[PDB]
Paper text:
Y-family polymerases are able to bypass a variety of DNA lesions that impede high-fidelity replicative DNA polymerases. 7,8-dihydro-8-oxoguanine (oxoG) is the major known product of oxidation of DNA by reactive oxygen species induced by either ionizing radiation, photochemical mechanisms, or normal cellular metabolic activity. Our kinetic primer extension studies demonstrate that the bypass polymerase [name] preferentially inserts C opposite oxoG, and also preferentially extends from the oxoG•C base pair, thus achieving error-free bypass of this lesion. The [name] polymerase embraces the 19-mer template/13-mer primer DNA by its four domains: palm (residues 1–10 and 78–166), finger (residues 11–77), thumb (residues 167–233), and little-finger (residues 244–341).
We have determined the 1.95-Å crystal structure of the [name] insertion ternary complex with oxoG-modified, 19-mer template/dideoxy-terminated 13-mer primer, and dCTP positioned opposite oxoG. The finger domain, which is on top of the C7•G13 base pair in the active site of the preinsertion binary complex, is now positioned over the replicating oxoG(anti)•dCTP base pair in the active site of the insertion ternary complex. The side chains of the hydrophobic residues V32 and A42 and the backbone of G58 are packed against the purine ring of oxoG, and the hydrophobic residues A44, A57, and Y12 are packed against the pyrimidine and sugar rings of incoming dCTP. The oxygen atoms of the relocated phosphate group form two hydrogen bonds with the guanidine group of Arg331, one hydrogen bond with the guanidine group of Arg332, and two hydrogen bonds with the hydroxyl group of Ser34. The carbonyl oxygen at C8 forms a water-mediated hydrogen bond with the side chain of Arg332, thus helping to lock the oxoG residue in the anti conformation. By contrast, the phosphate group of unmodified G forms only two hydrogen bonds with the guanidine group of Arg332; thus oxoG(anti) forms four more hydrogen bonds with [name] than unmodified G does. We find one Ca2+ ion coordinated by the catalytic triad, the second chelated by the phosphate groups of the incoming dCTP, with the third ion coordinated by the loop of the thumb domain (residues 181 and 186), adjacent to the tip of helix H.
Author numbering: 1 to 341
Write the structure that this text describes.
DNA sequence: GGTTGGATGGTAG
DNA sequence: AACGCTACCATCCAACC
């Protein structure tokens, strides 16, 4: 098979640049303001000009302003980026019937029946890039390989505004030479566990006892890495179905006062219920982020669907459980609905 | 021993 | 050191077939 993966370039910042062209060439930082103080929050993303100086996703806005105090700091307008994304995804639908929308700015296309080889795949990749630039003036990176994982890795290698094929021979070289930390799904915790076992490359997972690898990183990740290393990973492109919808907000101050927290939680429920749009959940979880940014959650699954009124009542009980069973103050509070009918 | 549900862990967008 | 918000799959544990 052949898989073509598309990853939009510095997406949120690039959309802002398209809607206001004077931003291009100079550092733009898209921010998630919590409302705590002036400028409390995190960077969602920045364009490559700000990113050159270390302003990247996840860092505090305060750290970013220390590095580049003269950059443009824009509030995140997620709804705008979602609508642009949906338009681009609709363009991609024209090139394959088999498409997997992986996120707000990623999609996998199974183009096995559309092209005969990697040269034709590459030309299709170029066609897709030109189409998205024509219609939306958004640059993207395309990665192409035998499966979803190596397609994603290919795009990682080609980013800013690139295109890359990893053919069968390069898959073999990467199994030997790619830092296993750069494999999709291997974060810092798993990477460091692997390094302690002396595993630096995918091929190293074949030289360890399965029971030992499973003991350290778990069965799923062990099976996943071994399948990749054996050149056998072949997970199909399929339609992802949304499994949960939720909202969590930062409170104006930390609190353990039930009556102070309730209005935030209730607003999170109202917004979550609107986003449900005909979906009726059977499960509710109240999620608290404590003072030190730990996550505590209490939930319940009902035999039937949950009305909004039941969500209110139950959410209070679950919040009460969090307060009873955890003595830390709550910083952020929210809700998540799942198990849709 | 497998499935379910609840609490938590790890991950990536 | 600071510090947002969305949502996926996985693991551990105990209840229950
Ligand atoms: N911690 C993060 C990471 C990403 N995003 C959002 C903003 C990004 O623009 C978008 C896509 O994530 P990417 O990791 O692909 O980031 P970029 O597209 O901005 O950069 P890149 O050029 O590496 O693809 O998701 C976010 O809100 N919070
Ligand atoms: Ca990506
Ligand atoms: Ca991207
Ligand atoms: Ca990694
Ligand atoms: Ca139980």
């Amino acid at each position: 098979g052949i898989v073509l993966f598309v990853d939009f370039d510095y997406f949120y910042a690039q959309v802002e640049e398209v809607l206001n062209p004077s931003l291009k060439g100079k550092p733009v930082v898209v921010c998630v303001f919590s409302g705590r103080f002036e400028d409390s929050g995190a960077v969602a993303t920045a364009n490559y000009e700000a990113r050159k100086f270390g302003v990247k996703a996840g860092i505090p806005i305060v750290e970013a302003k220390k590095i580049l105090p003269n950059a443009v700091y824009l509030p995140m307008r997620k709804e705008v980026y979602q609508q642009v994304s949906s338009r681009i995804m609709n363009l991609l639908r024209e090139y394959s019937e088999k498409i997997e929308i992986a996120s707000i700015d990623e999609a996998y296309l199974d183009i096995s029946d559309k092209v005969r080889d990697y040269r034709e795949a590459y030309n299709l990749g170029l066609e897709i890039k030109n189409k998205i630039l024509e219609k939306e003036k958004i640059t993207v990176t395309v990665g192409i390989s035998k499966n979803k994982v190596f397609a994603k890795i290919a795009a990682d290698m080609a980013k800013p505004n690139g295109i890359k094929v990893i053919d069968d021979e390069e898959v073999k070289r990467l199994i030997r030479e790619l830092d296993i930390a750069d494999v999709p799904g291997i974060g810092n915790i798993t990477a460091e566990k692997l390094k302690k076992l002396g595993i630096n490359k995918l091929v190293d997972t074949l030289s360890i006892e399965f029971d030992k690898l499973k003991g350290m990183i778990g069965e799923a990740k062990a099976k996943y890495l071994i399948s990749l290393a054996r050149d056998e990973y072949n997970e199909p492109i399929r339609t992802r179905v949304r499994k949960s919808i939720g909202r969590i907000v930062t409170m104006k101050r930390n609190s353990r006062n039930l009556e102070e927290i309730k209005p935030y939680l209730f607003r999170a429920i109202e917004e979550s219920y609107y986003k449900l749009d005909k979906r009726i959940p059977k499960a509710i979880h109240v999620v608290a982020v404590t003072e030190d940014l730990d996550i505590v959650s209490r939930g319940r699954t009902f035999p039937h669907g949950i009305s909004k009124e039941t969500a209110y009542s139950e959410s209070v009980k679950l919040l009460q459980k969090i307060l009873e069973e955890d003595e830390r103050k709550i910083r952020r509070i929210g809700v998540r609905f799942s198990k849709f009918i």
